[PDB]
Amino acid sequence: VYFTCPLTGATLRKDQRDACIKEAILLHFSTDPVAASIMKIYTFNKDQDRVKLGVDT
Amino acid sequence: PNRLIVDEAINEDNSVVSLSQPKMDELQLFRGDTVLLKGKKRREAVCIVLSDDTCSDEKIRMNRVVRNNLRVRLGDVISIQPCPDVKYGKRIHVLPIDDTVEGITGNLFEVYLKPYFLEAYRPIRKGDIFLVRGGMRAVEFKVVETDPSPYCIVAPDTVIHCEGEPIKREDEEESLNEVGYDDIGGCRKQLAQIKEMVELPLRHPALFKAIGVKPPRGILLYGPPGTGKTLIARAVANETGAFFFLINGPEIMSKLAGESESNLRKAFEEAEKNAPAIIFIDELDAIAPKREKTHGEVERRIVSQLLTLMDGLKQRAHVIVMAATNRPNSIDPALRRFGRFDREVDIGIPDATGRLEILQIHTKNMKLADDVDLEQVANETHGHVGADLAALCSEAALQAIRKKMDLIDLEDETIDAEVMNSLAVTMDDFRWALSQSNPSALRETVVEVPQVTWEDIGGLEDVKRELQELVQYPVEHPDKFLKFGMTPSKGVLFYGPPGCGKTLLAKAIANECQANFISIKGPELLTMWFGESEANVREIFDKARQAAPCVLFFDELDSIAKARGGNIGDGGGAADRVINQILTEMDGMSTKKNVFIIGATNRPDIIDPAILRPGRLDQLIYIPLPDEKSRVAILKANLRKSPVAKDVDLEFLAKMTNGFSGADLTEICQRACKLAIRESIESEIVPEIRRDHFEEAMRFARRSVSDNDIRKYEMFAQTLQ
Amino acid sequence: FISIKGPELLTMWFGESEANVREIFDKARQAAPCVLFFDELDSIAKARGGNIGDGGGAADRVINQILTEMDGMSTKKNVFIIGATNRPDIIDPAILRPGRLDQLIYIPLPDEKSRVAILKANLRKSPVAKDVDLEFLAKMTNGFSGADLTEICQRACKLAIRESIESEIVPEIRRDHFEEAMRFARRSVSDNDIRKYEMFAQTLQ
Amino acid sequence: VRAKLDRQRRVFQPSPLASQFELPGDFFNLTAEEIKREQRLRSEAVERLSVLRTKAMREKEEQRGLRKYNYTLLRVRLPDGCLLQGTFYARERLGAVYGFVREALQSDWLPFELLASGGQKLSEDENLALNECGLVPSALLTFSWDMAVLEDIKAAGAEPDSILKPELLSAIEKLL
Ligand SMILES: Nc1ncnc2c1ncn2[C@@H]1O[C@H](COP(=O)(O)OP(=O)(O)O)[C@@H](O)[C@H]1O
Ligand SMILES: Nc1ncnc2c1ncn2[C@@H]1O[C@H](COP(=O)(O)OP(=O)(O)O)[C@@H](O)[C@H]1O
């Protein structure tokens, strides 16, 4: 199964998805630290109900 | 690789086969792909592959139409070869088989072939035989020309042609109207039991050829007439390919001495000459009745000839003899000795599910109207056997035929196919036929899986768990029972006030086990006592074994003690003829027979104490009157099938009805239901049960169990804990 | 050993087939040396109402055939006949005359040392922890019969098995299982019956 | 941020040579080894029907079968003999399959229908998941043009000899 990384355009497999996106978000801190931390809060955390409570607080 | 064993199919469609999903994964084919199947005699068939959650990994499920085209039978092996290159067809020429088109004429394309292929995209190969049903006739067709070769997919743009005389069937090919396993509805288990007993000695006889142990040679099928005993024997012979030789009592008994034995032994000789073969002896009790019941030379001489022929089967390799009787005890006991007819199967009476399956089979060719519901029919046809459901469908068809044929006015040697295609059978014709039909098995005991489930019983949460543990623990921890030297119990007695769910508990555990429930009621125990026919108790316990897995429920164990007085008392005591035989039979039941024996009594102080001795009903459960929270649960269960208004306060009722049994709470619910119906009828000449209906019901409903009766049960319960 | 149980004597009585008694005694003559045991000799009297019943006597068809066969049986056949009853007050006294079951043995409820022996014997089929004080249990079960000590042994076993199964959702029966069993186990012979049994045995001297 | 599932759209051409294979007569002779598995399953089937077991035990047998698949691979059979293939999540909506096909068709505006493997019509307006439509973990769908446009195509004498864009057909692969 193949997937496209929306941050880099790289072609990934089912196992490589989180590894490439997480790396792209951590690298993005050199361009826009606020946008990079925003992507990290929603992307790295699997529990979205806690993310919504954290962001609202 | 890519070779699977042929099995039965569930999907009724004739263009599909089912594989287990992992095999489709190994073959890299998808649901809906077209594949070729390689069969015997250099033949092949083309079909669509699907999958389900029931097919075994190493099997392919295909129906009779596909199996016949491959010239294969159940248990054979075929190869699967995907053929994605198949193209859409342009023109296919299809002609009927003469054996199935007789007495009928008309435009067969419009009636059969057109709707059959209409947006179906069925694969078709030259030479294939396929079946189309309709107009109360089963018509099969042969494909004689395909523009592409040798197969293609039919499409809406494919020309379907049909001109020419019907085709004469090849003698090597069997008709699809022959009885097979797909023609048998209920009693599926009994068919599976026969499969094991019959396929082995006929397909794999060498297991017994070299070894000194001989195979079972006879299988005795028994049960009420019209349950399919002959149908099963014929279907098994046809499905396995063995030659079927038919014998019946009247045919042999109508002959004179010498002629009768000659015909009997001739059939055995032919079975060997054409082996493998199955000999089916119908009405075994007619050819071989109990010896003490007859003194005629022919009646005894034909039995001696049968006994010798059965014993001679040791040399007649690959031949098995099946027989049918009404009851296992109506035949000369010599036939039931080891060897000969040592194995037997109880066919029984189809239950509500089996009756629905039987009706669906007989209606396969019938055009049912949208208002017809065969499940409603199956629920009403209590006491009917397959022979009666076949008559029911025929009568419903004839009623529809008369109503429309009187208007059609077609008087000729043949019937138009179009007018039969437009002839529908309505629910009124089934209801009419039900009023004219009379069940042939209304006197025999009906045994089936009950419909009562745990959701229907209020309260008793600990009893529900206990009954489940008594079923799973003896097999989930056999090492712990053996370690401590404990024998698992095989039964329980329920005691306490009436109307608390004693019967429901026995049914609910049978339901959740999907086990047969055998109900013995007071009047039956009293009938045996009064009529000095306690010997019939053995038949009850023998039914439980044959019905296993089952729950054998002996209700009203005090029925005879009360009949002899109970509160006053005649010249007898606690023991009687019937309970003594019941106790004797219980001592012969093993824990491995999958029979759970449950008793119930409303007066445990007057039941023969022997019933609670070790080895009998070793478990003892008290069922008290429901408490407040249980009474609410009972009211909700009793009202589960009716609309109840939001103003009805079921907790308020439960708080008042402190001394009421579950049966007494039902009277309240049913009274409120009747009152709601009365009001609705008055307004027509309201749609839900209102509090006013329950409050009025409370004016009449009373507790059936008094405070003194409660203490009577407490004293017994505390005595034995 | 020929075991004729209550239900067999009742079957012959209920069906008026006392002729079968001759076949039972014929087994004893042909099976010799043998012991012919007639259990629950009072099963018919109890099946006739026991304490009340009808106005008739203790004699009936089955026992009369038994008495007849006993009179026709010689000691030279090496056959010894044993009876048992738990209600001797309603047994046909003819069975105790010379030539029949003329010997009488009273079997009282076991005493303290016997009850311990019974508990130890019944527990030979299961693992039992060393913490179980069988003498203490016997001291409490003063009015219990041997059959009642069996129920205690089995009840404590049932508890040990249930707990073992639950632990996976133990290796032996613990003192707690016997002490818990004592909370439900009861004597089957009441104090009124104990005095009746002793007074009857005393009357016979 | 989640990686977008790449449809990996492909068109395939079957090779008639894949269907040409002859079997020796002995290939249909059931072995003693197969007979042992077949006879074992015969006895086990009777034992399954025979046992008195509560629903909790029955669950353990069902549970063994149940939980494997979370993806699907779909293929569409086109009137022109080509096979259009692409990948989907098992919970994807039927509307994604329509869109997937429309992006591949030479004329994405021309009304068409997709039929399931059993002949059941899949409606574009019915927002059901592929695991609810019976198209998981794989299925072949049948492509047909709407009847309204087929009547105009036939009446005009136009042979619909190309279903897909030349942009995808130039990369057609043979089935292996
Ligand atoms: N279990 C069943 N399933 C399907 N059809 C049945 C069943 N039992 C009986 N029938 C039908 O009822 C009829 C039975 O008559 P017959 O074949 O003579 O057998 P028998 O009289 O031994 O029951 C047949 O038409 C058969 O199809
Ligand atoms: N515990 C209960 N829960 C729900 N309904 C009950 C309960 N006990 C009795 N009933 C009602 O009483 C009716 C008769 O119950 P049944 O089990 O036949 O009583 P019995 O066992 O004394 O014959 C049932 O139809 C049921 O609606």
Author numbering:
A (entry chain G): 121 to 177
B (entry chain F): 23 to 707, 728 to 763
C (entry chain A): 539 to 707, 728 to 763
D (entry chain G): 266 to 441
The authors write:
p97, also known as valosin-containing protein, is an essential cytosolic AAA+ (ATPases associated with diverse cellular activities) hexamer that unfolds substrate polypeptides to support protein homeostasis and macromolecular disassembly. p97 forms homohexamers that enclose a central channel through which substrates are translocated and unfolded; each protomer consists of two AAA+ ATPase domains (D1 and D2), an N-terminal domain (NTD) and an unstructured C-terminal tail. UBXD1 contains three conserved p97 interaction motifs: a VCP-interacting motif (VIM) helix and ubiquitin regulatory X (UBX) domain, which canonically interact with the NTD, and a PUB domain (peptide:N-glycanase and UBA-containing or UBX-containing proteins) that interacts with the C-terminal tail. Here we identify UBXD1 as a potent p97 ATPase inhibitor and report structures of intact human p97–UBXD1 complexes that reveal extensive UBXD1 contacts across p97 and an asymmetric remodeling of the hexamer.
